UniProtKB/Swiss-Prot annotation, chains A, B:
Belongs to the Nudix hydrolase family. CPSF5 subfamily. It is found in: Nucleus; Cytoplasm. PANTHER family: PRE-MRNA CLEAVAGE FACTOR IM, 25KD SUBUNIT. Expressed in the heart, brain, placenta, lung, liver, skeletal muscle, kidney and pancreas. Acetylated mainly by p300/CBP, recruited to the complex by CPSF6. Acetylation decreases interaction with PAPAO. Deacetylated by the class I/II HDACs, HDAC1, HDAC3 and HDAC10, and by the class III HDACs, SIRT1 and SIRT2. This is Cleavage and polyadenylation specificity factor subunit 5. Homodimer (via N- and C-terminus); binds RNA as homodimer. Component of the cleavage factor Im (CFIm) complex which is a heterotetramer composed of two subunits of NUDT21/CPSF5 and two subunits of CPSF6 or CPSF7 or a heterodimer of CPSF6 and CPSF7. The cleavage factor Im (CFIm) complex associates with the CPSF and CSTF complexes to promote the assembly of the core mRNA 3'-processing machinery. Interacts with CPSF6 (via the RRM domain); this interaction is direct and enhances binding to RNA. Interacts with CPSF7. Interacts with FIP1L1; this interaction occurs in a RNA sequence-specific manner. Residues 72-74 are annotated as: Interaction with RNA. Changing residue 124 to A: Reduces affinity for UGUA RNA by 50%. The lineage of its organism: Eukaryota, Metazoa, Chordata, Craniata, Vertebrata. Residues 3-117 are annotated as: Necessary for RNA-binding. The modification Phosphotyrosine is found at residue 10. It comes from Homo sapiens. One of its GO terms (molecular function) is identical protein binding. SUPFAM superfamilies: Nudix.
Length: 197, 197
């Protein structure tokens, strides 16, 4: 009767948000972005992307940690895998690069749950939680994982971003604010048994 | 790197859809429905509901089995738990009542995965994949489970319903056609590794 995965959440006030050098995108525009996606596809095939969902609470309400690029777009911490790179080892690496500490102290990332899969059929924005009818060579595969945090940690946040804590209700049905992946996190996280430490 | 649950899907042509006596709803209208929900709440508290997701394929495309009530509403097989009734034992019972055989041959239901949770804060239609801000006494809790089918089976379908197989793309972003629970099944099923037998 208890088939649900059990997850420890801690207070947002348990975590320290420091700063480090800016981290700039590989692509200076959307047009550059899909161009580099075409070049790499012809050379090494489908892009493989990994993204981590980090969760906290304040006063027993779960929030998702989102990365805000100035006052423009919201992102989940993650990035592109190299060819032959392990998914889980890759997401740990990408999250050490983004939020890992100035003082070189190892973060202990715990990743044991897949929460979703998304596919990009063309060199265009549209993405789906399945492979569409007729598509044999999708251009990107995005994998999402749940990241269990330690009781406390310090995260060094590149100066050009801010780390914000979004409650679920703000995400729910906000595809325009957030896009179709982040706006379905409430549905995707509903199977978990959160403990509010 | 393989953290995904593995699920066996079979061809739709592997299953037989026979018929049995009509099964009528406890409530003859929406108004009757919320009235009986008020009466039962005051007596035994929050309504507890369970619903099963049954999946097949044809030519390697996953479909969800939906129950259609004439040409009106689409439903997942499930129903209301009695007080002190186990969730999993309840969903098996409710699914034997709905699709179990005229000839009294035991179906073998395999249920090992929670796929979601929904909450109804008032005696009204709106439901959310979380408990909203300020709500201490929600009126209904709905639990969704993945039901692994056997290679073949015969299902006896009450004469007043039809069992239809909906592909994911038809569900995706169709809240008006289907409502907010069924229309988010593609996001919810994306974590599984389907084998297409
Ligand atoms: C929309 O987000 C993605 O596609 C994956 N995330 C990143 O690339 C990323 C970049 C930085 C900094 O932190 N995460
Ligand atoms: C929208 O569906 C529900 O609330 C749960 N399902 C049923 O009550 C139900 C009734 C019959 C027949 O098969 N399933
Ligand atoms: Zn508090
Ligand atoms: Zn793929
Ligand atoms: Zn085929
Ligand atoms: Zn509850």
């Amino acid at each position: 009767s208890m088939l649900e995965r059990t997850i420890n959440l801690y207070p947002l006030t348990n975590y320290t948000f420091g700063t480090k050098e800016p981290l700039y995108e590989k692509d200076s525009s959307v047009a550059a972005r899909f161009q580099r996606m075409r070049e790499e596809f012809d050379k090494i095939g489908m892009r493989r992307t990994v993204e981590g969902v980090l969760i906290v609470h304040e006063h027993r309400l779960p929030h998702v940690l989102l990365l805000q690029l100035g006052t423009t777009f919201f992102k989940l911490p993650g990035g592109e895998l190299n060819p032959g790179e392990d998914e889980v080892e890759g997401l740990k690496r990408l999250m050490t690069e983004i939020l890992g500490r100035q003082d070189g102290v190892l973060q202990d990332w715990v990743i044991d749950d897949c929460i979703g899969n998304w596919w990009r059929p063309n060199f265009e924005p549209p993405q789906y939680p399945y492979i569409p009818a007729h598509i044999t060579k999708p251009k990107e595969h995005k994998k999402l994982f749940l990241v269990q945090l330690q009781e406390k940690a310090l995260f060094a946040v590149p100066k050009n971003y801010k780390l914000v804590a979004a409650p679920l209700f703000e995400l729910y049905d906000n595809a325009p604010g957030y896009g179709p992946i982040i706006s379905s996190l409430p549905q995707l996280l509903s199977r978990f048994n959160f403990i509010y430490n």
